[PDB]
Design a protein around this ligand. Structure first.
Ligand SMILES: CCCCCCCCCCCCCCCCCC(=O)OC[C@H](CO[C@@H]1O[C@H](CO)[C@H](O)[C@H](O)[C@H]1O)OC(=O)CCCCCCCCCCCCCCCCC
Ligand SMILES: CCCCCCCCCCCCCCCCCC(=O)OC[C@H](CO[C@@H]1O[C@H](CO)[C@H](O)[C@H](O)[C@H]1O)OC(=O)CCCCCCCCCCCCCCCCC
Ligand SMILES: CCCCCCCCCCCCCCCCCC(=O)OC[C@H](CO[C@@H]1O[C@H](CO)[C@H](O)[C@H](O)[C@H]1O)OC(=O)CCCCCCCCCCCCCCCCC
Ligand SMILES: CCCCCCCCCCCCCCCCCC(=O)O[C@@H](COC(=O)CCCCCCCCCCCCCCC)COP(=O)(O)OC[C@H](O)CO
Ligand SMILES: CCCCCCCCCCCCCCCCCC(=O)O[C@@H](COC(=O)CCCCCCCCCCCCCCC)COP(=O)(O)OC[C@H](O)CO
Ligand SMILES: CC1=C(/C=C/C(C)=C/C=C/C(C)=C/C=C\C=C(C)\C=C\C=C(C)\C=C\C2=C(C)CCCC2(C)C)C(C)(C)CCC1
Lengths: 174, 498, 144, 244, 143
């Protein structure tokens, strides 16, 4: 079940392939803007691209099977880039939300008060990430696409061998 | 079960590789062996078309699939349909007749006939290739034979023409290779180059447009499209007339065949985007070449610009999205392959006697040479879109395909219909003038030109054997159209709402 | 506007219920055929003329020329289908049911003839074409 | 010796460059990637442009070698993921035969003739058709002409470049390969001159002699390779993607 | 101070088995492979964080596991004791995942490391945290 009501709705268009990916489906993410306003606003603004920079053309740069997919690095694409709409980093809001299971979209940070533009979608229950990562969304549609991204073959690191690229990101009004 | 198409492709080049085992001098044994190979291959294609090709089948036929390279997922894949069998038969016919008409060649006859058989094999391999990289390889496999034929048996400016030809074709074909790489790597799981599975592929609009541009640059370099046509006048004007048969009858149609097979079939959305801009380009190409032709004093350059003008009707039939337009484009392909080759052959044979180039000094040739005058006049009439010939019915069917087209509404349908009409006013204006500057009038010729000067039995047979199908198609066009009415419909089936 | 932007329009559905009950359209219809817009009188004249053209198809029926029978049947069938739709849509309300019934019978005969052609059965083709022939004669008698 | 330094020096230096840019310098890939991209683009551009203005055969082959090395550099640039090092070999294996054949023909021609200028290569087809045929085949393989080894080697090198998203590198490689036809065709254009007035006296007094000689065997082990490896480009890569 | 920003999700927590040398460790995953051999090159994956859980280094950042000769003092003493073992620490096995808390005297000591151009990578007297993962023993050929 959903931990909170969905205020704003965002969606991704996932493309897998090399060098130009083929579209595989749509991933719809509902944002819990009531509990975490700043993080949800940051994610929505990066999805729409109103600030100039956004998730369009970015890639899911870290995939661990049966654990998590992680992306949101439009700057460098290796995990060392990404800026929020406020600054380079912004403070962790609060940790009332919990990694309740698959489809949980949370913030990936270098540490406390170091949230940026990088997010990760969990595919299993991760109760060890609570009080350390800001959970701000839930995947509503396209979980099969998320599992398809997870099943991608990976190199010696965790980068997928085939580039999983977000072709077009935005909002779906409801 | 038997590999018919593989045997057809392999046989000419494999037989020509053995032409160097002959220790004989001269050209007699070499040319008779080459014509034996050409006629055996022609009979083989005739057997294939008679017994294993079904014109009512819109699917691929006689397919053969052998995996050659695993990394590219690259297969030697061959297959024929209603689109390819016409060009294949035309290739065999024109190449055999060009081998027959290249008989006075006594300098390096072995290499000449080997290159002719290699050209045979390469053209047939292109026209029956169902793999994108195999298509690209067979496309590239003619840069060297045509270069050698031009540079060793051409005219006065043969070397510059050969260099320009090979550099222009390489410049187009690198864009062809980029398009091949882009289309063959779009697969999400594994690369694929088979045309059958690529005909169902779905692309975004921008990527489809980019791939279409990458293929269209190559197909506009090969099939002469303004302004990528500048290699053709000096390439065809300064080439051997036997090589001019293949250049103006077979190699020019390869760009159109690639346009139907790849641009029209594999990428229909980008083709629908680009076709209205192709119509204006084709009409301006007709007008531009039909106006450039009177400005050429050279006879062969005038014929080459006439070929550029005649390619505009093929471009129009391609861009007009109807079954009738595509049928007219195929009919014009066959008609031009029957007309331009014979015109170049007659020009070369006439030059072998008169030994003059510019039209303002070749008066009175009709007095010592009446039969070549008759053949030249008849093939000019065929060029003139005269009824009873294939050119008239091809242009008429292209006009009907434009008039019946649903993509364009009224005013462009007028301004294009008027457009090519201006072309068939300009097409007489030089052509008859050409004849008037090449055969009419009186000149005092030598007594030795009274006998053993006209066309012999061989040249008469060649001209008659290319002229007869022109009349046979101009009387009954469905001798050709019935081979491709079905498959063209399938090609059109992707252009409507689904 | 100069040219259409999207894909070309397909088979426009008839608004007189002359199509097949299960599918809403007939099998012999071909997309991409140019039909000239004349009106009810011109559609009636073309309907009669093309019924005569299809009754001129006895010679084409044979073991070797069934594909041309199918091609001519599809071409003329699309033409008379849309002409019949045009003339029923402009007919008086009292005359619409008999015209619709005649069109339905004619198009069922067209489907049966095409089905017989597909199996390459010549006596079946001849019998279906005889039924089509009496229906076409009825069509020209009605629309003279 | 220059043929040896053309084939042996590039193999060892390519191995050292691959083992010094991947094993101890993988953390700074974004720097030596740019360095190698500049080093390759400049190499093809300034090795194929100057080779078309050469009057000496060995110097033209030098500019040829410094042009073909840029194609191999793309294999390092793409990396081991999208094949890559498997495209360094299966092209260096090609390149060895291409250069050693096109240098063996030069060795025999110079020994029987006594010259190095390209203008003295005119009319060799009339004197020695076998040597002219072999040299033409080696040069056409050097230009990436279709039925010969260089064409498949270049499309293998460009497939991995396109797969890695290096459109600029592949485009420059294709444009420089187009430029790389005018030479490797100029020599053939000289070789097929039947004009006795343009034939240098260097080849007029040319004796082929009725003996085989060792270089003929050495380049018959080569000319039959650069043409008949074109089907066998599936046996070679499965030995080169097996390494990692 | 000169911390390169790397966004990585955290690892499961532990109870730290403190030893005589001051090192703390836990076995997140006990490896089923060969234990870390002495004087041998091994590839491991690590995520080096400072105190206050801020990551300053990671082998995932470079894209491949780090190769080091273990057991002969080519790394800091805390990493050697965590991986190779000894002094109450069992050796790690192939496939094993282990957390490590290196005190300052087992790390870089009271001297900052990587000092150049007005900043240093590691501050003085810093306790380091390592989520090491023994990927395997080094081999010339990969699968
Ligand atoms: C012909 C160009 C005009 C067509 C539309 C171009 C457009 O929308 O941008 C199309 C392209 C962008 O390219 C886009 O890239 C995306 C990557 O996330 C996806 O691959 C898209 O499918 C691709 O179209 O514009 C460019 O920046 C490239 C310009 C053309 C490059 C060739 C220069 C020579
Ligand atoms: C003048 C009118 C005569 C009509 C017949 C000749 C057609 C001339 C076309 C030019 C014109 O005026 O319309 C110019 C067109 C008219 O607009 C086009 O046509 C229709 C509307 O009439 C449709 O709306 C098309 O979608 C619209 O693009 O304007 C453009 O959109 C041009 C911009 C794109 C130009 C790209 C060139 C691509 C070249 C590739 C080769
Ligand atoms: C034109 C030339 C190629 C003709 C088409 C190639 C297909 C030939 C038969 C089908 C096939 O799978 O052959 C497969 C062949 C065999 O080639 C290799 O042979 C090896 C045997 O030790 C293994 O089977 C390899 O997997 C296989 O690729 O692949 C080719 O490379 C074809 C050309 C063989 C060399 C001829 C010189
Ligand atoms: C065995 C069958 C022989 C067929 C008749 C041969 C006729 C012949 O030789 O006539 C011409 C060759 O005939 C043909 O080419 C006939 C082609 C057959 C096509 C028939 C169908 C066309 C209708 C050329 O002969 P000539 O005397 O005119 O030659 C001299 C020359 O013209 C000037 O020096
Ligand atoms: C089909 C394409 C045939 C031409 C391309 C080709 O294979 O290369 C050469 C064709 O090679 C041959 O001449 C054939 C003998 C060697 C065989 C090479 C492969 C032949 C074709 C294989 C199938 C394609 C072209 O140059 P050349 O050697 O003809 O140059 C003139 C020569 O010096 C005259 O002696
Ligand atoms: C497409 C094709 C083809 C086919 C074709 C055909 C199908 C044909 C037919 C044809 C026909 C079925 C015909 C009929 C008839 C004819 C006639 C009847 C003729 C006559 C003529 C005459 C008598 C004369 C002439 C002349 C000459 C020769 C020249 C000069 C001028 C004149 C005109 C005088 C081929 C195989 C080639 C191959 C390729 C493809």
């Amino acid at each position: 079940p959903l931990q909170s009501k969905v205020t704003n709705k965002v969606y991704f268009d996932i493309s897998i392939g090399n060098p130009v990916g083929k579209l595989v489906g749509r991933v719809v993410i509902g944002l819990f803007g009531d509990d975490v306003p700043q993080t949800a606003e940051n994610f929505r603004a990066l999805c729409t691209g109103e600030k100039g920079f956004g998730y369009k053309g970015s890639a899911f740069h870290r995939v661990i099977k049966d654990f998590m997919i992680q992306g949101g690095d439009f700057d460098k694409g290796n995990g060392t880039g990404g800026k929020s709409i406020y600054g380079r980093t912004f403070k962790d809001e609060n940790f009332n939300l919990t990694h309740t299971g698959p489809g949980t979209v949370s913030m990936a940070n270098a540490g406390p008060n170091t949230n940026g533009s990088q997010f990760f979608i969990c595919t299993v229950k991760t109760p060890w990430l609570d009080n350390r990562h800001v959970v701000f969304g839930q995947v509503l549609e396209g979980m099969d696409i998320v599992k398809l991204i997870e099943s991608s073959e990976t190199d010696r690191g965790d980068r997928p061998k085939k580039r999983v690229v977000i072709s077009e990101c935005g909002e779906l009004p409801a | 079960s038997f590999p018919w198409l593989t045997t057809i492709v392999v046989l000419p080049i494999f037989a020509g590789s053995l032409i160097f085992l002959f220790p004989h001098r001269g050209n007699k044994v070499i040319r008779w062996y080459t014509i034996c190979i050409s006629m055996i291959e022609l009979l083989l294609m005739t057997y294939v078309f008679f017994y294993h090709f079904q014109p009512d089948d819109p699917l691929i036929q006689l397919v053969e699939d052998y995996k050659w390279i695993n990394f590219f997922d690259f297969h030697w894949r061959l297959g024929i349909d209603g689109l390819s069998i016409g060009p294949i038969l035309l290739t065999g016919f024109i190449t055999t007749l060009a081998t027959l008409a290249a008989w006075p060649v006594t300098r390096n006859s072995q290499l000449f006939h080997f290159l002719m058989l290699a050209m045979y094999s390469a053209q047939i391999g292109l026209f029956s290739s169902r793999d994108l990289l195999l298509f690209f390889i067979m496309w590239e496999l003619e840069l060297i034979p045509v270069y050698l034929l031009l540079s060793m048996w051409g005219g006065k400016k043969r070397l510059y023409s050969a260099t320009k030809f090979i550099l222009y074709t390489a410049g187009g074909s690198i864009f062809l290779l980029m398009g091949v790489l882009g289309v063959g790597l779009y697969g999400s799981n594994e690369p694929t180059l088979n045309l059958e599975t690529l005909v169902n592929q779905s692309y975004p609009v921008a990527l489809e447009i980019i791939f279409y541009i990458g293929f269209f640059i190559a197909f506009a370099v090969k099939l002469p499209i303004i302004p990528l046509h500048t290699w053709l006048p000096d390439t065809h004007g300064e080439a051997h007339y036997s090589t001019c048969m293949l250049l103006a009858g077979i190699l020019l149609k390869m760009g159109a065949y690639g346009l139907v097979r790849i641009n029209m079939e594999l990428l229909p959305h980008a083709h629908s985007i680009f076709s209205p801009w192709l119509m204006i380009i084709g009409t301006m190409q007709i007008i531009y070449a039909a106006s450039t032709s009177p400005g050429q004093r050279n006879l062969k350059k005038r014929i080459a610009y006439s070929s550029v003008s005649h390619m505009g009707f093929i471009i129009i039939g391609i861009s007009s999205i109807t079954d009738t337009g595509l049928n007219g484009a195929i009919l014009q392909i066959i008609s031009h392959g029957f007309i331009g080759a014979a015109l170049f052959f007659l020009a070369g044979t006439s030059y072998d006697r008169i030994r003059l180039v510019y039209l303002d000094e070749m008066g009175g040739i009709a007095i010592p040479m009446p039969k070549i005058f008759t053949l030249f006049s008849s093939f000019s009439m065929a060029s003139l879109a005269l009824p009873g010939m294939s050119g008239f019915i091809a242009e008429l069917i292209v006009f009907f395909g434009l008039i019946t087209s649903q993509k364009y509404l009224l005013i462009p349908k007028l301004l294009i219909t008027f457009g090519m009409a201006i072309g068939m006013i300009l097409t007489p204006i030089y052509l008859l003038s050409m004849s008037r500057q090449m055969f009419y009038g009186y000149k005092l010729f030598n007594i030795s030109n009274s006998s053993f000067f006209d066309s012999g039995p061989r040249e008469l047979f060649v001209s008659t054997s290319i002229f007869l199908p022109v009349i046979g198609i101009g009387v009954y066009p469905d001798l050709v159209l019935s081979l491709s009415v079905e498959k063209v419909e399938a090609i059109l089936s992707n252009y409507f709402y689904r | 506007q100069l040219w259409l932007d999207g894909p070309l329009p397909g088979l426009r559905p008839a608004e007189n219920k002359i199509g097949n009950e299960e599918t809403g359209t007939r099998t012999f219809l071909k997309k991409g055929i140019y039909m000239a817009n004349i009106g009810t009188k011109g559609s009636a004249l073309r309907l009669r003329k093309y019924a005569f053209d299809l009754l001129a198809m006895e010679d084409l029926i044979g073991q070797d020329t069934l594909n041309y029978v199918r091609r001519y049947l599809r071409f003329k069938g699309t033409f008379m289908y849309y002409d019949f739709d045009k003339v029923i849509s402009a007919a008086p309300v009292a005359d619409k049911p008999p015209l619709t019934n005649l069109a339905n019978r004619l198009f069922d005969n067209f489907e049966k003839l095409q089905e017989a052609v597909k199996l390459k059965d010549v006596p079946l083709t001849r019998s279906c074409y005889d039924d089509t022939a009496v229906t076409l004669q009825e069509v020209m008698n009605r629309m003279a | 010796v220059v043929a040896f330094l053309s084939v042996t020096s590039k193999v060892a230096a390519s191995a050292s460059a691959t083992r010094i840019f991947d094993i101890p310098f993988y953390f700074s890939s974004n720097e030596w990637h740019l360095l190698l991209e500049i080093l390759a683009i400049l190499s093809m551009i300034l090795g194929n442009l100057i080779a078309i203005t050469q009057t000496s055969m060995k110097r033209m082959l030098a500019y040829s070698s410094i042009g073909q090395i840029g194609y191999v550099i793309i294999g390092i640039i793409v990396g081991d993921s999208n094949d890559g090092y498997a495209s360094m070999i299966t092209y260096m294996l090609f390149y060895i035969s291409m250069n050693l054949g096109t240098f063996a023909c030069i060795v025999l021609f110079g020994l029987r003739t006594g010259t190095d200028n390209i203008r003295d290569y005119a009319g060799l087809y009339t004197k020695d058709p076998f040597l002219a045929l072999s040299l033409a085949l080696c040069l056409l393989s050097l230009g990436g002409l279709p039925p010969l080894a260089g064409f498949f080697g270049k499309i293998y090198l460009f497939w991995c470049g396109w797969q890695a998203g290096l459109y600029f590198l592949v485009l420059i490689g294709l444009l420089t390969s187009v430029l790389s036809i005018y030479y490797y065709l100029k020599i053939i254009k000289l070789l097929m001159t039947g004009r006795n007035q343009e034939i240098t006296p260097h080849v007029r007094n040319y004796r082929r002699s009725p003996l085989r000689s060792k270089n003929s065997i050495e380049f018959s082990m080569i000319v039959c390779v650069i043409a008949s490896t074109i089907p066998g480009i599936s046996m070679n890569p499965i030995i080169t993607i097996a390494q990692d | 101070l000169r911390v390169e920003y790397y966004a990585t999700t955290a690892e499961p927590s532990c109870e730290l088995n403190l030893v005589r040398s001051g090192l703390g460790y836990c076995d997140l995953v006990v490896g089923s492979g060969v234990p870390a051999p002495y004087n041998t090159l091994i590839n491991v994956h690590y995520t080096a964080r400072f105190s206050d859980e801020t990551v300053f280094d990671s082998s995932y950042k470079r894209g491949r596991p780090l190769t080091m000769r273990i057991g002969v003092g080519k790394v800091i003493k805390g990493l050697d004791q965590g991986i190779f073992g000894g002094d109450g620490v069992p050796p790690m096995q192939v496939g094993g995942k282990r957390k490590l808390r290196i005190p300052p005297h087992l790390g870089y000591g009271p001297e900052p490391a990587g000092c150049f151009s007005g900043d240093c990578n590691v501050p003085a007297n810093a306790t380091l945290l390592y989520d090491v993962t023994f990927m395997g023993v080094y081999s010339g050929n990969r699968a």
